[PDB]
Amino acid sequence: DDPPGKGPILRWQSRIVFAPGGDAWHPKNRKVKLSVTVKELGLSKHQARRLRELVGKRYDSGKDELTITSERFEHREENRKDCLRTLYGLIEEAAKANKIAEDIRTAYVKQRLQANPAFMQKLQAKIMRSK
Amino acid sequence: SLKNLVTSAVTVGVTEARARIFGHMLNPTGQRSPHKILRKKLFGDKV
Amino acid sequence: DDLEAGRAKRLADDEKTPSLDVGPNGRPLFTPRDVTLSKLSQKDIGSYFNFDEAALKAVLPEGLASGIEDEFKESWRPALLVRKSFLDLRDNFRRIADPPMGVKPKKQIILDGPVKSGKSIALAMLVHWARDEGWLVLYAPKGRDWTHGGYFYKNQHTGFWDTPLQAESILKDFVKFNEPRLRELRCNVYDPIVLGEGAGVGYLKGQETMPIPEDSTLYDLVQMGINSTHAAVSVVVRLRKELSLVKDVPVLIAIDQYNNWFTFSEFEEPVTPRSCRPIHARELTTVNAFRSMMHDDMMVGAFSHSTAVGKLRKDLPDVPADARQNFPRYSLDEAEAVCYYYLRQRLVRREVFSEENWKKIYYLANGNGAEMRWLVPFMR
Amino acid sequence: GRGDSKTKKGKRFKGSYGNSRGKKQKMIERIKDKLELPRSTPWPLPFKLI
Amino acid sequence: IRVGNAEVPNHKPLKTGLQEVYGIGRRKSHQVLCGLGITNKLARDLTGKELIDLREEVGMHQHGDELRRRVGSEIQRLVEVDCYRGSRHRHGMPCRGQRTKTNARTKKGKRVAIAGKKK
Amino acid sequence: XXXXXXXXXXGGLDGEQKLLIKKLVNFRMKEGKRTRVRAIVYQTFHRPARTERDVIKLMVDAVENIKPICEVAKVGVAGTIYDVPGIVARDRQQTLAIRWILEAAFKRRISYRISLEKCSFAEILDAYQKRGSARRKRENLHGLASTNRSFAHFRWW
Amino acid sequence: VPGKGKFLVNDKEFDVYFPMLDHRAALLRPLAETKTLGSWDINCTVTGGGTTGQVGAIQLGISRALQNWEPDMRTALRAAGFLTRDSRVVERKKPGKAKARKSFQWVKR
Amino acid sequence: STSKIKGTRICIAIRSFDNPEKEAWCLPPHSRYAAMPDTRTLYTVLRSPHVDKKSREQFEMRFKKRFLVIKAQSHELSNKLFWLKRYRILGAQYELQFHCKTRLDMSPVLGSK
Amino acid sequence: MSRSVWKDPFVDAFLMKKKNAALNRKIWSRRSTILPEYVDSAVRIYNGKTHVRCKITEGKVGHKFGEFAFTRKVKKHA
RNA sequence: GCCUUGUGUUGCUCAGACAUGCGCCUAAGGAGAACUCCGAAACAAACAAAAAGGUGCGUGACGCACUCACGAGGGACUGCCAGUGAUAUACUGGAGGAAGGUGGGGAUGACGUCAAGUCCGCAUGGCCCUUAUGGGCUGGGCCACACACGUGCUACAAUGGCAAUUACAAUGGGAAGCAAGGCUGUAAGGCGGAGCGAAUCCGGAAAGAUUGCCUCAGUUCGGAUUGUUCUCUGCAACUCGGGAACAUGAA
Numbered sequence A: 001d002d003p004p005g006k007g008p009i010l011r012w013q014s015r016i017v018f019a020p021g022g023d024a025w026h027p028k029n030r031k032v033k034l035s036v037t038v039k040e041l042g043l044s045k046h047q048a049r050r051l052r053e054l055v056g057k058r059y060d061s062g063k064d065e066l067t068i069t070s071e072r073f074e075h076r077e078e079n080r081k082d083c084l085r086t087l088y089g090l091i092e093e094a095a096k097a098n099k100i101a102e103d104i105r106t107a108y109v110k111q112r113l114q115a116n117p118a119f120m121q122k123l124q125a126k127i128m129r130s131k
Numbered sequence B: 001s002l003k004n005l006v007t008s009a010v011t012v013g014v015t016e017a018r019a020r021i022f023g024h025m026l027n028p029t030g031q032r033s034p035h036k037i038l039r040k041k042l043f044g045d046k047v
Numbered sequence C: 001d002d003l004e005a006g007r008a009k010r011l012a013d014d015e016k017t018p019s020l021d022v023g024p025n026g027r028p029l030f031t032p033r034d035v036t037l038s039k040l041s042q043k044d045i046g047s048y049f050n051f052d053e054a055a056l057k058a059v060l061p062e063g064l065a066s067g068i069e070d071e072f073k074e075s076w077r078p079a080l081l082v083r084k085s086f087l088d089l090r091d092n093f094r095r096i097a098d099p100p101m102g103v104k105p106k107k108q109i110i111l112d113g114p115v116k117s118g119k120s121i122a123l124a125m126l127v128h129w130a131r132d133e134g135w136l137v138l139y140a141p142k143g144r145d146w147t148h149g150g151y152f153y154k155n156q157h158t159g160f161w162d163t164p165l166q167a168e169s170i171l172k173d174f175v176k177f178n179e180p181r182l183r184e185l186r187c188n189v190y191d192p193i194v195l196g197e198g199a200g201v202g203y204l205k206g207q208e209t210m211p212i213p214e215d216s217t218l219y220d221l222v223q224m225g226i227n228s229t230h231a232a233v234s235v236v237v238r239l240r241k242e243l244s245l246v247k248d249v250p251v252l253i254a255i256d257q258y259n260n261w262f263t264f265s266e267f268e269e270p271v272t273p274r275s276c277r278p279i280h281a282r283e284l285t286t287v288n289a290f291r292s293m294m295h296d297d298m299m300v301g302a303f304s305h306s307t308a309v310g311k312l313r314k315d316l317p318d319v320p321a322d323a324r325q326n327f328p329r330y331s332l333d334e335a336e337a338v339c340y341y342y343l344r345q346r347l348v349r350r351e352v353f354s355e356e357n358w359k360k361i362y363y364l365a366n367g368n369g370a371e372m373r374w375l376v377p378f379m380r
Numbered sequence D: 001g002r003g004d005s006k007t008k009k010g011k012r013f014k015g016s017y018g019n020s021r022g023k024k025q026k027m028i029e030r031i032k033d034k035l036e037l038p039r040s041t042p043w044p045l046p047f048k049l050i
Numbered sequence E: 001i002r003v004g005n006a007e008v009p010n011h012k013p014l015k016t017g018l019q020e021v022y023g024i025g026r027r028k029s030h031q032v033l034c035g036l037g038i039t040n041k042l043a044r045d046l047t048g049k050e051l052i053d054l055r056e057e058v059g060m061h062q063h064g065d066e067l068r069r070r071v072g073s074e075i076q077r078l079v080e081v082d083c084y085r086g087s088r089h090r091h092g093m094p095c096r097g098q099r100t101k102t103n104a105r106t107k108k109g110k111r112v113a114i115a116g117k118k119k
Numbered sequence F: 001x002x003x004x005x006x007x008x009x010x011g012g013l014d015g016e017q018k019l020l021i022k023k024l025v026n027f028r029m030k031e032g033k034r035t036r037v038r039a040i041v042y043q044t045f046h047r048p049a050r051t052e053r054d055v056i057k058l059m060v061d062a063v064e065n066i067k068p069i070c071e072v073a074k075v076g077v078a079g080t081i082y083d084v085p086g087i088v089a090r091d092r093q094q095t096l097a098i099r100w101i102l103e104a105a106f107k108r109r110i111s112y113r114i115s116l117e118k119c120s121f122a123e124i125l126d127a128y129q130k131r132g133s134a135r136r137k138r139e140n141l142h143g144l145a146s147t148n149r150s151f152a153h154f155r156w157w
Numbered sequence G: 001v002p003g004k005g006k007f008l009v010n011d012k013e014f015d016v017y018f019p020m021l022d023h024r025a026a027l028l029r030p031l032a033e034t035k036t037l038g039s040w041d042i043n044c045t046v047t048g049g050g051t052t053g054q055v056g057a058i059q060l061g062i063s064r065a066l067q068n069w070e071p072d073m074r075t076a077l078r079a080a081g082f083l084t085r086d087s088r089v090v091e092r093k094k095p096g097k098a099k100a101r102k103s104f105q106w107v108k109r
Numbered sequence H: 001s002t003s004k005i006k007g008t009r010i011c012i013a014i015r016s017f018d019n020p021e022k023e024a025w026c027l028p029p030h031s032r033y034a035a036m037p038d039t040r041t042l043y044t045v046l047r048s049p050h051v052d053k054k055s056r057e058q059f060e061m062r063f064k065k066r067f068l069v070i071k072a073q074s075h076e077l078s079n080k081l082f083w084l085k086r087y088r089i090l091g092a093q094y095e096l097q098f099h100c101k102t103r104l105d106m107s108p109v110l111g112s113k
Numbered sequence I: 001m002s003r004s005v006w007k008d009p010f011v012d013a014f015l016m017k018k019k020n021a022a023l024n025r026k027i028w029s030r031r032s033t034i035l036p037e038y039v040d041s042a043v044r045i046y047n048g049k050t051h052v053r054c055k056i057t058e059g060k061v062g063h064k065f066g067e068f069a070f071t072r073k074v075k076k077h078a
Numbered sequence J: 001g002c003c004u005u006g007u008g009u010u011g012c013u014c015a016g017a018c019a020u021g022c023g024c025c026u027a028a029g030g031a032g033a034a035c036u037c038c039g040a041a042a043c044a045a046a047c048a049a050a051a052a053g054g055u056g057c058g059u060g061a062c063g064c065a066c067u068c069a070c071g072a073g074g075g076a077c078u079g080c081c082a083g084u085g086a087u088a089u090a091c092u093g094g095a096g097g098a099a100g101g102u103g104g105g106g107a108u109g110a111c112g113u114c115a116a117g118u119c120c121g122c123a124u125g126g127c128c129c130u131u132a133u134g135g136g137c138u139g140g141g142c143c144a145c146a147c148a149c150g151u152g153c154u155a156c157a158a159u160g161g162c163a164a165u166u167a168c169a170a171u172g173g174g175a176a177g178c179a180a181g182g183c184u185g186u187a188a189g190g191c192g193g194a195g196c197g198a199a200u201c202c203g204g205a206a207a208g209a210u211u212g213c214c215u216c217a218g219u220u221c222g223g224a225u226u227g228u229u230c231u232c233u234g235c236a237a238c239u240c241g242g243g244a245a246c247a248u249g250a251a
């Protein structure tokens, strides 16, 4: 059964090694993984394509699973926070694709409207009236 | 067509943004760099 | 070498009496002599079409296929099996040629299938039928020769590569049979032929373009390409261009070993003073003229697995997506007919033949023609 | 010639690579150039090889 | 034919015949023939245009008696500077760290120098 | 049964013929490489298989023509070497005949420099007609056996 | 499965998987011994080993499946020995020796 | 059912030199049980302190692993962790794997949609 | 860059700070490269037992110091 | 090596079914007669999902039938039949079975002999050295070379050498680490890092088969020796390291 409240659901993985002898530090301690479903974020298709390009192989298509793993920090909570910051940065950068889509669509539309004898006379008359 | 332009211009600018998000080191010209020898542990104490 | 004397003696004695020409369930083994290839019926499936060797060489002067020659040297008789797969292909191209007064026929057909199933023999029988219909048939029995052997020079205008020896052998094999029709036909473009580098003799000095006369025929063009080694490549390209504008007779282009044009060629180009780079088959001029199936003409391209071409894509470039056809292996009745044919041709002994014996050989060879042919003398 | 260091057998005996033997990159580049693909196509190929 | 400074046999194929030139081996022959645009042909079937192209293509590499003279001159300058390698070259000893206790017979000679007259 | 799986599936052979085929394949195999010699043996069988006949019965006849019945052995009595004759068993006859066939075929291969299938079929066909190098080897062995027939009763086996 | 003659090895045709005629002959021998050629549709998945090892494994599997289909052909298959698992495997290498049984060259004097 | 437990759970990986099944009483209660392949490491030493090259003795080191699955809901994970921190398994080292799910806050990124 | 070798040649530290005037003395550093600023000078190179006297010329530039001071005596058997 | 029984994730998931994700190649505009129509457009688009057809790579749900992994067991004992024999011990054949007579292989090594080997692994009785036979650094040597012997590697080729295509393993190793994809260099190399402390992630098995070249040559056999140009590890490759490129081509 899923968590409380509402929103997209994350999945965490974390390790604790219980070594004997009174020395506690083990290299497997500091690795944290987080998994998310891409389609639950509700991004647009172009935003999803930019996300996939920005991600590479951390995205698995059969499950729609985006998994981020952090080992670069010395403590488990630090790697967890790094994973969440990376997820927020990925969503923020992936959302930008709509503006580029709108800009190049308007560029194509305006290229189509420049080469038209019907529209150019009306545009020139309207800019001649106001000079 | 419009389809190839819309499918190709949305994936641009990712090269520096990915390095900024993930903290990677970017070397576009492939010179010899000390990053590969500073990314390894300090095995002095162990010894 | 008196081994074959007894077999030849008994074979010469066996033609004196016609009660031995019986096949599976006693049906007569061969076609009636009054039947030609254009009038083959459903009821002829499972029989053997007799030929003449000199007449077959006359109809196909470009060279007999390796499968046909291998079957002939071991059966000792110019005969071929009539199958359903050839009949349906013939009906396809007859429907394409002239519609009769739910099966949409296809203009461009690629023959893929299991190794040693008879694609070369089927394409050769189709070319024989079309030339009996008197069409304009361009037959390439060895597509490996177009990319292997000879000189290679870079074209200074297009960037592609010129192969003059193969460019003149294509024209020679075309006009060895298609001379009297090319005397009739006329060219539809009169632009000058731009000259190219010759086969080891370099660029012609003084002559840059050969002008086309007003009353020039396709025969005049091809004879110009044969006689001048500085013009063969451009004449081959031009000939490909006028093969699509002819309206008098139907035109068919049949290529064997069609898969060799989708891989590397023999030639290599130096791209660095300490390195070399291989050249794809698409970068040849004579391959580039003929490879694309994006047109309106009747093209057949039969792959070959005997040549070690390797793996290709399922969606090949510059061809329609539905152009690929499967050429199936032998079935039970085809194997029964070929086993009784080898019994008639005395490739096996009369005292060891049985239903179980030929079924065992067929099930081992999995319907492979060459493996069945090589296995059946060991039938005991 | 397993002792000839300029041949593929000799390079395999020495446990090294060169023009004669070549790494996995050479097979990948050659198979990309064979099937008419851009060199930036990710390996393995997203097609069906028949 | 007289290409470089050596005789190329007329009856042999060109790829194996061109290796007769000093300074041309198995791979430079392939590079030269690929530069000329020729796969392989007999050396007596060569046209004069291909002969002058072959001469100008072979002339792009150091080859022949000048290469022999260069190699001899630098072996001589090592002796004249008299480093360790020059001393080994003058004494006819192996100069690339190889053992001389048992197995230096290519630089030294046959075991016809025999016995050594005592145990 | 591992040798000649094709001729075992297309069955109808006895133990003696199976043994003959296995021996003819395996005697010249080096370094465990069976494919080339099995292809050579199959095509040598196929050369008269396309022209009627029973090629395996031809092989049985050819080997029977070169089986030797008596051989010699070197026995030391009081310091001098004698050459004692003895009787050859049924397996050793077969092995000696097939070894002589393959030896003569390979010497003919070196002498004429032609295809090995041609050499093997040439020697087997000539051995079918009671002549050849293998038959001369058999008669030479019988000559050495019949020259020293007085020195039997020196036999130890 | 009872069928018409299909035979698949790892989703490929067996003519493709075993291009040698002798491997196919060894694979079709158990069917030809119990006289059931042309009655079966066989799908197998093979792995490990080399080529003759894979052929032997598929042959033993076919023989055991035939016996499971109908147990009265056991007397047919046991004479050809298609139900005996071959126990011969690669013997280990012993220390002080070059191979399993080959020793180093001995020096006496 | 016998399908895989996917959700909020604990997984214990136990590594040992001996079989953990020898002393089964010290294992925690669990829903599922499975075993991994054993791993061996080979040592070959000379027997003599001097030249007896052909006489060797061969020792090995063998590693064994076992995998335990515990189903647990979200409220009792912090209750179970206190006891799981204090276990005593005989001749073993254990590995605590935690599978839990939280939710995503969308408010500071919803402006970019 | 027009450099053919990406790495500097090796010269020892007591040469790197004095250069030429540390070049008329006994040296023990056989592993130092002969620099083009070292020409026309006399050194005594240690060979394990003695100091071989060597005058640096044009022909020794680029080699090592120890290439010209031999360690093993050339032997003549009886 | 064969068969039961229990446990099934990082392993298996065959057939027969249910649902799904992602990427491609086409051509495709809303409303009242069986959503069709007769309604709107100027110009090609397929846009917030939905809307067609060929496809490629997968995943989940159900399972763990099957392979495999692990724990515990079974099974082979001359047990049964016939003969030879001295009714014993045995020997020779057969049946059944996965396996037949010690089923294959390993581990296991008696009393003592060689005054066998080790005081330079270690511990030790006796003698000996003590501004030295003790301790430190740099440099050299253990890599020398008229010769002799031992152990190995590569070959003298056609049952072969080379190029292109195409198949099939097991044991192991990985944090001072293994490093997918991609860029750069003819190449060894260089940049950068998807995953992994590892049934989870990480390294084209070769002989083999198909096609072609070579045609008995001191050779397209064989790669010693040598020159030039570089590269990796390291404070440092002269004596004295590994590797690459091109050339030289002994016996």
Ligand SMILES: Nc1ncnc2c1ncn2[C@@H]1O[C@H](COP(=O)(O)OP(=O)(O)OP(=O)(O)O)[C@@H](O)[C@H]1O
Pocket: C066, C067, C068, C070, C071, C080, C081, C082, C083, C114, C115, C116, C117, C118, C119, C120, C121, C122, C303, C304, C305, C306, C307, C368, C369, C370, C373
């Ligand atoms: N209709 C037929 N009549 C006689 N023989 C046939 C026929 N079909 C196939 N065969 C036999 O099959 C053998 C191989 O035929 P073919 O050379 O056409 O193979 P393929 O299908 O072209 O495949 P590939 O070109 O890859 O070998 C021939 O030797 C021939 O004996």
Ligand SMILES: [K+]
Pocket: E097, E098, E099, E100, J143
């Ligand atoms: K030395």
Ligand SMILES: [Mg+2]
Pocket: C119, C120, C256, C257, C303, C304
């Ligand atoms: Mg063909």
Ligand SMILES: [Mg+2]
Pocket: D001, D004
């Ligand atoms: Mg060689």
Ligand SMILES: [Mg+2]
Pocket: D025, D029
């Ligand atoms: Mg590259």
Ligand SMILES: [Mg+2]
Pocket: D025
């Ligand atoms: Mg790579």
Ligand SMILES: [Mg+2]
Pocket: G089, G090, G091, G092
């Ligand atoms: Mg083992």
Ligand SMILES: [Mg+2]
Pocket: none
């Ligand atoms: Mg079970």
Ligand SMILES: [Mg+2]
Pocket: none
């Ligand atoms: Mg028994």
Ligand SMILES: [Mg+2]
Pocket: J108
């Ligand atoms: Mg015991």
Ligand SMILES: [Mg+2]
Pocket: J115
């Ligand atoms: Mg003593």
Ligand SMILES: [Mg+2]
Pocket: J120
């Ligand atoms: Mg001592």
Ligand SMILES: [Mg+2]
Pocket: G104, J151
């Ligand atoms: Mg030894």
Ligand SMILES: [Mg+2]
Pocket: J193
């Ligand atoms: Mg990483």
Ligand SMILES: [Mg+2]
Pocket: none
């Ligand atoms: Mg491990």
Ligand SMILES: [Mg+2]
Pocket: none
């Ligand atoms: Mg091979």
